[PDB]
Motif scaffolding. Structure first.
Motif, PDB file in Angstrom:
ATOM      1  N   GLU A   1     110.296  94.407 -53.807  1.00  0.00           N
ATOM      2  CA  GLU A   1     109.409  93.478 -53.071  1.00  0.00           C
ATOM      3  C   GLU A   1     110.166  92.280 -52.461  1.00  0.00           C
ATOM      4  O   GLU A   1     109.597  91.557 -51.678  1.00  0.00           O
ATOM      5  CB  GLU A   1     108.217  93.001 -53.911  1.00  0.00           C
ATOM      6  CG  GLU A   1     108.573  92.087 -55.074  1.00  0.00           C
ATOM      7  CD  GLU A   1     107.369  91.607 -55.879  1.00  0.00           C
ATOM      8  OE1 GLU A   1     106.246  92.202 -55.812  1.00  0.00           O
ATOM      9  OE2 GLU A   1     107.581  90.616 -56.597  1.00  0.00           O
TER      10      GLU A   1
ATOM     11  N   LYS B   1     109.752  97.380 -58.870  1.00  0.00           N
ATOM     12  CA  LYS B   1     108.846  96.760 -57.940  1.00  0.00           C
ATOM     13  C   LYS B   1     109.293  95.340 -57.594  1.00  0.00           C
ATOM     14  O   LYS B   1     109.315  94.978 -56.443  1.00  0.00           O
ATOM     15  CB  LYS B   1     107.434  96.661 -58.519  1.00  0.00           C
ATOM     16  CG  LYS B   1     106.401  96.077 -57.542  1.00  0.00           C
ATOM     17  CD  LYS B   1     105.539  94.981 -58.138  1.00  0.00           C
ATOM     18  CE  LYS B   1     104.394  94.674 -57.175  1.00  0.00           C
TER      19      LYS B   1
ATOM     20  N   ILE C   1     106.669 101.112 -49.601  1.00  0.00           N
ATOM     21  CA  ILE C   1     107.206 101.870 -50.708  1.00  0.00           C
ATOM     22  C   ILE C   1     106.142 101.940 -51.806  1.00  0.00           C
ATOM     23  O   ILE C   1     105.692 100.900 -52.301  1.00  0.00           O
ATOM     24  CB  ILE C   1     108.477 101.218 -51.231  1.00  0.00           C
ATOM     25  CG1 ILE C   1     109.490 101.164 -50.067  1.00  0.00           C
ATOM     26  CG2 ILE C   1     108.986 101.972 -52.452  1.00  0.00           C
ATOM     27  CD1 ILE C   1     110.926 101.091 -50.498  1.00  0.00           C
TER      28      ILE C   1
ATOM     29  N   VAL D   1     105.711  96.776 -50.887  1.00  0.00           N
ATOM     30  CA  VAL D   1     105.714  97.673 -52.003  1.00  0.00           C
ATOM     31  C   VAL D   1     104.392  97.601 -52.748  1.00  0.00           C
ATOM     32  O   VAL D   1     103.835  96.531 -52.948  1.00  0.00           O
ATOM     33  CB  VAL D   1     106.934  97.414 -52.947  1.00  0.00           C
ATOM     34  CG1 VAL D   1     106.771  96.122 -53.708  1.00  0.00           C
ATOM     35  CG2 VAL D   1     107.099  98.525 -53.955  1.00  0.00           C
TER      36      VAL D   1
END
Ligand code: NI
Lengths: 199, 207
Positions: free
Chosen positions: B27, B23, B86, B32
């Motif tokens: 990001e 993540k 995402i 995300v």
């Protein structure tokens, strides 16, 4: 030894009364049980939830009652009467867009009733009877989550009309014993007692 | 386009770390959203508290979680995917498949039950044996009853229940690999090496 008897019909069909009338009468001959809740707080806390989630909520509650009351008493040879069973979910969920074959699979852990009485009555006639008794038309009964802004009397004709469609489509596959609900409550119950009298 | 990346693995497998580390990388380039399977929401809590007195069967336990997940999905997950996000899921439906099926609910029915959720674009299975995960757990922290399958094996030491319980979860995940196209990551490798491999697979996809 265990026997499962189910009733289905639109709201106003008198099916709950028939189910309770049959319990009281079978109790004279042998062991019988009638299906008798947090769903309260969930609906109350919504405020939306999709129809999919609604279908799961009702299936969760159904599974609880099924595995804790319906199935065990069947195993001890009770007759079990339930005045709504999975077919009520088939209709409730699919008129709101959920894939009925998906609902069927969802409920496929439940056994098919030995008998299912479809107390068939039209919405016109169900309404005129609710009106002659001066009862108030519940929003759930009018399908107000699908038809807001119809009156309660016309929601009832529309929603219960859609529900009737689904029950009629299940009659053949699910072997519903179709009963004429225009008959009086006595005539209906005596015919039901006569049918159950057999199996 | 939106992309859904799921992480699966046993407790103590490191998968949450790996999700979080992914993540933080992704990001930097784009939008995300990281969700955790185990972070149940309002509907779950109301049902469990209301039924705190009663003993729930596995089928019912399983529907409570699917019900709660259906709400989180339509409300958070699908909209984030449609909005181009995402989405990273630390534990996804496969966790329910394992959980509910080691408690006797037929896995084919659970699959049907969750059929409404889309398959991940990529599912990483960070495979780590239960012995190895136990050892990391000790070398840190006590084991929770839920990590020990306490309801299924109340007669075992927490350690031994974690081994038997996590053993069974492992069997279920191993049997899904082929069908579910899991990307099986060797979870004995270092965390830095695991993340590098994950970053390369994800890179291949989204680039
Ligand atoms: Ni839970």
């Amino acid at each position: 030894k265990g026997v499962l008897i189910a009733f289905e019909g639109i709201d106003g069909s008198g099916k709950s009364s028939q189910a309770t009338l049959l319990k009281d009468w079978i109790e004279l001959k042998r062991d019988v049980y009638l299906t008798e809740d947090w769903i309260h707080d969930i609906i109350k806390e919504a405020k939306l939830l999709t129809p999919l989630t609604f279908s799961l909520i009702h299936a969760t509650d159904f599974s609880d009652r099924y595995e804790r009351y319906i199935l065990p008493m069947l195993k001890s040879g009770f007759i079990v009467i339930s005045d709504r069973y999975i077919y009520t979910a088939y209709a409730r969920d699919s008129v709101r867009g959920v894939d009925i074959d998906w609902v069927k699979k969802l409920y496929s852990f439940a056994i098919k009733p030995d008998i299912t009485f479809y107390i068939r009555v039209s919405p016109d006639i169900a309404l005129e009877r609710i009106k002659k008794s001066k009862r108030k038309i519940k929003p759930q009964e009018a399908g107000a989550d699908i038809f807001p802004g119809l009156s309660p009397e016309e929601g009832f004709l529309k929603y219960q009309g859609l529900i009737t469609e689904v029950y009629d489509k299940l009659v053949k596959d699910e072997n519903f014993i179709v009963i004429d609900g225009t008959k009086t409550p006595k005539e209906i119950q005596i015919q039901i007692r006569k049918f159950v009298g057999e199996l």
